[PDB]
From a paper:
A potential problem for in vivo data gained from mouse models that are not transgenic for human COMT is differences in the structures or activities of the homologues. In order to assure that the binding mode of compounds to mouse COMT is the same as that for rat and human COMT, it was hoped to determine a number of mouse COMT crystal structures in complex with selected inhibitors. However, in our hands mouse COMT proved to be difficult to crystallize and only an apo structure was obtained. However, when comparing this apo form with a human COMT apo structure, three loop regions that adopt different conformations in human and mouse COMT are identified. In human COMT the α2/α3 loop is disordered, but it is well defined in mouse COMT. Loop regions β5/α9 and β6/β7 are well defined but differ by distances of up to 8 Å at their tips. Importantly, in the mouse COMT structure these three loop regions adopt the same conformations as in the rat COMT structures and (see below). While it is possible that the apo state of COMT can adopt several conformations owing to an absence of conformational restrictions on the active-site loops, the recurrence of the same state in rat and mouse COMT points to a stable state of this apo form that is independent of crystal form and organism and that therefore may be adopted by COMT during catalysis after the reaction products have dissociated.
Methylation catalysed by catechol-O-methyltransferase (COMT) is the main pathway of catechol neurotransmitter deactivation in the prefrontal cortex. COMT is a single-domain Mg2+-dependent methyltransferase that catalyses the transfer of an activated methyl group from S-adenosylmethionine (SAM) to its catechol substrate. The crystal structure of COMT comprises a central β-sheet flanked by α-helices, constructing a bipartite active site that accommodates the methyl donor SAM (in the so-called adenine site) and that can also complex an Mg2+ ion to which the catechol substrates bind. Here, a set of apo, semi-holo, holo and Michaelis form crystal structures are described that define the conformational space available to COMT and that include likely intermediates along the catalytic pathway.
Numbering used by the authors: 46 to 258
């Protein structure tokens, strides 16, 4: 099968049903063994948890999904009354992500919207009754981080204190996205570099907190 199908199969064969921690560990172990992604829990999961704990969002928007690791990671921390919206253009990735959340017992915490963010973001207010977002997680399509961010602003979906957290921001990648959020007085920025036990960056994340237009 595809890599995402194989990740799901592994979780289904090895993880404890209804146990988000077990699901995350199964994905992490498998991806590390395959050398597809090293210790994602230490490299990005702990940082995601810290951001969610710091800001305590009621409404999180995830832009992009692959196998559902990130959706499980975030959704497991959301209390009653809080929820995750996940947008992903690839229906195969959306499908795996749905099955992964189902396995973790987290389906009622998340709505998956299948389509291009360009098309869906402008529908959030009128179609999905959103006013503003508390947090945005930018997950996988780094060439879309800047245009997604500008569209969120254009649509009036960011408010003062909304936190954007972008994964896989490792120099010299995403130079335009970083120059934009750092250069703009509308964002307060923090960069995280995860080295695990060695000398080279394994994953990098940018936190950008909206300060208003
Ligand atoms: O795999 P993910 O976490 O969905 O990106
Ligand atoms: O590169 P870094 O982020 O400085 O460590
Ligand atoms: Na800035």
């Amino acid at each position: 099968g595809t890599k995402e199908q194989r990740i799901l199969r592994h979780v289904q064969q090895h993880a404890k049903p209804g146990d988000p921690q077990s699901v995350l560990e199964a994905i992490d172990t498998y991806c590390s063994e395959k050398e597809w992604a090293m210790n994602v829990g230490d490299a990005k999961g702990q940082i995601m948890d810290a951001v969610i704990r710091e800001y305590r969002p009621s409404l999180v928007l995830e832009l992009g999904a692959y196998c559902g690791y990130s959706a499980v990671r975030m959704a497991r921390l959301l209390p009653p009354g809080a929820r995750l919206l996940t947008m992903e253009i690839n229906p195969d990735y959306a499908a795996i992500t749905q099955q992964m959340l189902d396995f973790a017992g987290l389906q009622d915490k998340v709505s998956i919207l299948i389509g291009a963010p360009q098309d869906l973001i402008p529908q959030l207010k009128k179609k999905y009754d959103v006013d503003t977002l508390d947090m945005v997680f930018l997950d996988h399509w780094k060439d879309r981080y800047l245009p997604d961010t500008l569209l969120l602003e254009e649509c009036g979906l960011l408010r003062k204190g909304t936190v954007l957290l972008a994964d896989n921001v490792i120099v010299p990648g995403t130079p335009d996205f970083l120059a934009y959020v750092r250069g703009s007085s509308s964002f307060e920025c923090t960069h995280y570099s995860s080295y695990l036990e060695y000398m080279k960056v394994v994953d990098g994340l940018e936190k950008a907190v909206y300060q208003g237009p």
